[PDB]
RNA sequence: CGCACGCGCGCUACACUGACGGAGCCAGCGAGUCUAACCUUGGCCGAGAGGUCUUGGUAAUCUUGUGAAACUCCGUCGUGCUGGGGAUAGAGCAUUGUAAUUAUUGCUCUUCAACGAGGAAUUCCUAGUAAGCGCAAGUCAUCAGCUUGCGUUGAUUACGUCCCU
């Protein structure tokens, strides 16, 4: 179980693909270091599954973040998706599946902003 | 916290919000306690989220919007005026940039004085506009208990943004007073001045 | 009138509940532009604890 | 006044001019021997919680 | 040197589209791989290079005279 | 910052350059309180004196201004800005008048004295704008 | 560790290396980028007016270590600002280019950034090896 | 298109979530010369404007990843018809148009106005709708303000009937 997959999410028209394979455990989210992440407060807008399942299960992944689009509230609210999408690089081909039940109970209705397409649709103004 | 040693630089404070549970950089949510009968149920932090913006179809059925989230009902004490929502996205900053002063005054976690503060403005009585036929009088009746709530919470929506709009001091830092002694009737303030006037306005001409 | 603020701060930071520029307005001397200047040299005394930094919103906390 | 909590186990719909007023039947919340019919304006349903002020006022007209 | 089609009109594609893949074998002038263009409103625009005599692609062209 | 007070020194309102260039506004915008001096005249002094807009300003010394008298006192050699001023290389005279409170309005309206004594636009109708619009 | 140039923040690279350029004194002071403002989307010229130019002319130390353009009519597109037009909303900014003969022709004075032929400015090994001396006068003092 | 009055339209300013000096640099409905003067990607010419001294293009390539905006972070100012506004207007600059007049909008800098969310009445609102913010276009020789869109980021309050109609 290792996906060699660009797990794809459209950002409402765009290419929000996350490059996914196995790794070493080395978090690279958009160049700047975790010591000096430019929002000090929205720093914690990156970690939902690293307060739920723990830092013990998935320390063997190489996070990549490459999306097209964003602002205040989608750049540093939804690179949070990356540790629900590039932390979980553990479910297709190579390295053992066994941890599967707890990623299909705590990731079923948790936050549909990450684990499925967020339903903030575009804006037709009701003709 | 049994550390896994990394070649990627992470400080001491980043991983603290997991096992040492404080869902801000330095603030918790551990003590949800309530004295009176009005505002118990809707501190909806049960999913392990830092911000918890659950905005789905919580507006179609007739019961489910009572269970609407605390950021999506109750922490709307920050956005009410529209020159700051109309250049909108500067509006994430108030409570976390302000609340360490309230975390000094008899608060280990900042909800501890606020145990007996939010709920104890429990609304019991409010008139309706009587038809009257001429004389627009008022009747001794009861609304649902969301008015002295909104005399203390919707007057914190204005009381954080729109009563700090055009204020002598700043927007978010006139909130060094807004939840210190908001428990019971002081009557000497911007929102507590009409607190007796739900139990006497429906009592004076009844 | 030279260092009356020096004694009525070191004996009154554990009397004033906060440290800000509105402490100085009780004597009715200055309200003006010598305030956002004074946020980066005040706490070399060492009694009140700083917390956060932002260039558009420089906020600290009373102690 | 006693905060006479009225559990809203049954409800009579949504009427009025604007569609806000409501008739409400209540068997009591704390004890289970008061049987009071009331009127409350606004959104209420079956099996909720409300407040009524006085002791055992079975008043049927509160619009 | 190139060819550029011009396209203003989704329902009459499969007469020459199969003459590019299932019946371009009948004159042994092979093609280079077509990139799937993002179809703007429709423009189906093909491009063929010519290193050939005067006959074959102009046989596809000058028999296609039904104006 | 510095917890040090002084002995009757600082004022709050000055009287400087024949009018009120005040002791609560700086060189720059109290020369805007009097009409005729803008921002970058004394903000190009910042690359030579380092005095910007960030203070309550009953603090100025009359010897720093003497290296600004090296920029002021003769209006013919002393770095007068040339894409900046109120009226500047004028039809009126031809020089770049970065003048003062007593010397702007006397050096402002020789375009309004002119054109319809000359039969066109501003020599009767602006005098009508003084025989009617002035009283 | 593998401490490198891209793994530092926004101006803990530019304005943190400018804590040591003030002890050297190296770059060019222009004449009349000063009386003009630096752009159309501006209200007030910069404060410090001595650092003031070090904060601008070393902004290409990491921006073009990474990518390949800062232009003159080309930096219009990257630098759209807040142009309150009164009747219209904010819009796009056209910038200055005269005494970038003393500003953007002061970028090659440090030897970090040279000028690219695609349009813009590019980096060499002189801006990747010597930055392991001069930007690792910050990067090897953050380690 | 000149102004005793009066209305509406949108856009603002009446402030410290404000904008400013720079780094963190994203979209698409994308659109660009034939029997030629278009889109524009090299430094600088230039206080500034772009000419396209050049180049790339019959086109998701060359503009283009429209390196878009509101914007996030080191420095700027604690309430002073105010570092709020450029309101009105002048002087030092263009791309043009056979000439900028009743200046056609692109360009550097001062003049800094009424107005303390403003009496009556209200405009649209539910799983993607308020709310800002851009992009480029018939407006373009001077831009979009109207507009049709797309894109960016996306709040209190809710399933109800006539009280208005």
Author numbering:
A (entry chain Q): 3 to 129
B (entry chain F): 20 to 225
C (entry chain Z): 42 to 104
D (entry chain c): 5 to 67
E (entry chain U): 22 to 62, 85 to 110
F (entry chain S): 2 to 136
G (entry chain T): 2 to 144
Recite the paper's sentences:
A first round of image analysis allowed us to obtain a “consensus” 3D structure, with an overall resolution of 3.1 Å according to RELION’s gold standard Fourier Shell Correlation (FSC). Interestingly, in this region of the EM density map, previously described ribose 2-O’ methylations were clearly visible for adenosines A100, A420, A436 and A796. In line with the initial consensus 3D structure, comparisons of these classes showed no variations in the body region, and a stable positioning of Tsr1 and Rio2 on the 60S interface side of the particle. The first one hereafter called H1, representing 36% of the analyzed particles, was refined up to a resolution of 3.8 Å and appears very similar to previously published early cytoplasmic particles. Notably, the rRNA three-way junction formed by helixes h34, h35 and h38 at the base of the head is in an immature, “open” conformation. Amino acids 205–466 of Enp1, as well as and 351–405 of Ltv1 could clearly be positioned on the beak region. The resolved part of Ltv1 forms an elongated structure running throughout the full length of Enp1, extending towards the 60S-interface on the tip of the beak of the pre-40S particle.
Forming functional ribosomal subunits is an extremely complex and energy demanding process, which occurs sequentially and requires the transient association of 200 ribosome biogenesis factors (RBFs). Endonucleolytic cleavages of pre-rRNA release so-called pre-40S particles, which are composed of almost all RPS and the 20S pre-rRNA, a precursor to the 18S rRNA bearing a 200-long nucleotide extension at its 3′ end. They are composed of the 20S pre-rRNA, all RPS with the exception of Rps31, Rps10 and Rps26, and the RBFs Enp1, Ltv1, Tsr1, Rio2, Dim1, Dim2/Pno1 and Nob1. Furthermore, most of the identified RBFs physically block the association of the translation machinery by occupying functional sites on the 40S subunit.
